[PDB]
Design a protein around this ligand. Structure first.
Ligand SMILES: Cc1cc2nc3c(=O)[nH]c(=O)nc-3n(C[C@H](O)[C@H](O)[C@H](O)CO)c2cc1C
Ligand SMILES: Cc1cc2nc3c(=O)[nH]c(=O)nc-3n(C[C@H](O)[C@H](O)[C@H](O)CO)c2cc1C
Ligand SMILES: Cc1cc2nc3c(=O)[nH]c(=O)nc-3n(C[C@H](O)[C@H](O)[C@H](O)CO)c2cc1C
Lengths: 264, 264, 264
């Protein structure tokens, strides 16, 4: 990846390695949608559009020759910059085991939020439709713990009326999960009963949404298309510090809307 | 270890062996912090200081040549003495299976308390900071059994917002644990639910502290540095008895303060 | 030595080589104490302290457990900077045999003076004691040439009363040596008689001190401890020039005060 001008910065190999590790650790836990969507492999730094498979007609009816144009989806590219101090970084050679890296962490969290927003709610300038837009698959629920089990039992019938099958997963909000744990008039652990009502599924808690949803996980319904993964490069020097950046290129699509149900 | 003048005392091999075994047994159960800290290997009887990796400037701004001094941590050495009676020790050769060794046991307990005090609360003359000093990672709790589960669930989110992961452990006071067992309005064993709320963690009870704390156990955050381990040597003879001693050399350090949380 | 960022400066190999040679030449003649002290080998860029071998007690007398701290000496680190012009340096490629390098020479002389000052007179903030501090080994002398021979003959007896032996060396001030040469009422070369009064010793003249001293040279009494030797590195660029620096890390110690005598 020579377009990242890494050999022109005044650092050493050990000073690059720790910067890589610290960012990898946080990304792994803070990316949420990659826990249950599919990923299509990288194409390269030159890929530009993804085809849809249709034609739009632009001529009259009395013509002898008729014509139209093909359709596609364009990709999104992003960039974000930060700065670091040099004397502090140079204590690693004298033997300090812990150095200060707060700006990197704040920038990483901002990028993760931006990425999750598009998957959950979509983008209008690009023509992307998000998971919460499909408003004809919503069913009601209740407050007491048994209403959750009743709702799950009712949802599996709607799943089975079509041909949909496979492992099932629940995605829920953390405050509501805490309230469900707090309010237990019946004496039985909630997690065991919930995991048994699904045929051995699993539960994911997150602060991104407000209510709950249920999805199927056989494979092939939600896809994320990548051109280049997340990377770090070099920009310039500011007489006491250095300036660096983060970048990426992607798009998203939903194929079969039959594998998703919304609660409340 | 020739600096321990063991060959000049009037004893036999069997009389040395039982003295070693009795002390090993008690140390194993009474040292508490070694259950969850890391240990860096021995360096020797001549090691004196551990480096930190910084410079302190001591000159003016208009100088042509500028200079400073490096920084480090000094080690601690201790010694404690006791006495034993000779006719009583000589019945082992006639065939007695149980002899009287109470002074050794009392001294061992005193040494163990001194060692744990520095880890939990620090030393000021040497420049050591202890686990209870970090006062910006404390959260509130309650009296009823369900408040404990709520607090644990809230703590794991703070852990996951950073990159911290791994097995988790709870350290609690024994009287409070007994009260929690006694007050069970809900009908379910507390230990199973507590061990399941953590993803398969464990619980440690101790009389050293007053409240509870939660720690991560991936490895590399709390370290104890040793020069020489615990040993026994010979001093002199007092016309009816013998005099012996115990000694050691050590220091302690905390690297990443992100893996620790304090309750109440 | 990657902590010296030499690969990021805009120079060539020939332009580095001559800069190295010119500094080596001057250091060799201008470092004076290395002519008669001992040198302990390099340890590295991370070494921080040198042990002394003692304990200081900090507890009371009625305690059951007693403790103290170990002792050591900290190292000294220095840094000094200068600047050079680029068009002038570029004539070496066209074929000029002599280029202008005056700033480097002035800086080198300043560093040499700073180094010799600590050996001859010590430093108070660090706890170093210098050769002229030991004030109980001083004997009187005279002005005429024969008084020097009388003083040397008297000094060798004090040396032999202890067990000290080996080659002997004289260190003297240059103006006083010139006056001794000028005032020769007796007709015999002074150097031959002086070198014969010692059992084949040698003479060193220097502008650092005021009076003379006599030392033994069997080996093992005065030691200089080094972490990193003298080196050159790169800092930045100033739109017409480049900026560079010099650095080092050391300490000094006197072991046996019986091998030294002071005159007048
Ligand atoms: C003893 C000393 C050591 C220094 N070490 C470094 C260093 O490792 N990295 C750095 O960027 N600046 C360092 N500086 C600051 C840098 O040299 C400063 O900008 C001027 O060059 C000091 O004259 C150091 C300054 C001093 C006095
Ligand atoms: C029968 C007898 C056996 C003894 N055995 C021992 C012994 O094994 N070890 C010991 O320290 N003293 C022993 N003593 C005490 C010791 O001998 C005492 O100080 C005097 O030497 C007794 O005259 C013994 C005394 C007696 C009378
Ligand atoms: C004929 C000529 C040769 C030059 N050669 C050099 C050179 O070798 N190194 C340098 O630093 N500047 C050199 N300069 C100066 C440098 O080019 C100047 O800053 C401007 O670029 C001149 O337009 C040269 C200028 C001239 C006119």
């Amino acid at each position: 990846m020579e377009f990242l001008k890494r050999s022109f910065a005044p650092l050493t190999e050990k000073q690059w390695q720790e910067i890589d590790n610290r960012a990898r650790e946080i990304f792994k836990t803070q990316l949420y949608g990659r826990k249950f969507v599919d990923v299509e492999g990288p194409y390269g730094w030159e890929y530009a559009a993804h085809p849809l498979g249709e034609v739009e007609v632009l001529s009259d009816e009395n013509e002898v020759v008729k014509w139209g144009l093909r359709k596609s989806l364009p990709l999104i590219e992003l960039r974000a910059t930060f700065t670091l101090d040099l004397w502090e970084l140079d204590n690693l050679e004298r033997g300090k085991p812990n150095v200060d890296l707060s700006s990197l962490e704040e920038t990483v969290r901002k990028v993760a939020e931006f990425e999750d927003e598009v998957i959950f709610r979509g983008c209008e300038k690009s023509g992307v439709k998000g998971l919460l837009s499909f408003e004809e698959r919503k069913i009601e629920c209740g407050s007491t713990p048994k209403d959750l089990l009743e709702a799950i039992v009712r949802a599996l019938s709607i799943f089975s009326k079509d041909g949909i099958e496979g492992p099932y997963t629940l995605v829920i909000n953390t405050d509501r999960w805490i309230n469900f744990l707090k309010e237990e008039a019946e004496e039985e652990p909630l997690e065991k009963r919930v995991e048994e009502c699904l045929r051995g599924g699993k539960i994911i808690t997150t602060p991104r949404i407000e209510d709950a949803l249920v999805v199927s996980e056989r494979g092939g319904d939600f896809k994320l298309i990548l051109g280049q993964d997340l990377s770090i490069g070099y920009e310039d020097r500011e007489k006491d510090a250095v300036r660096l950046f983060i970048t990426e290129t992607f798009t998203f699509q939903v194929v079969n809307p039959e594998a998703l149900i919304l609660l409340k």
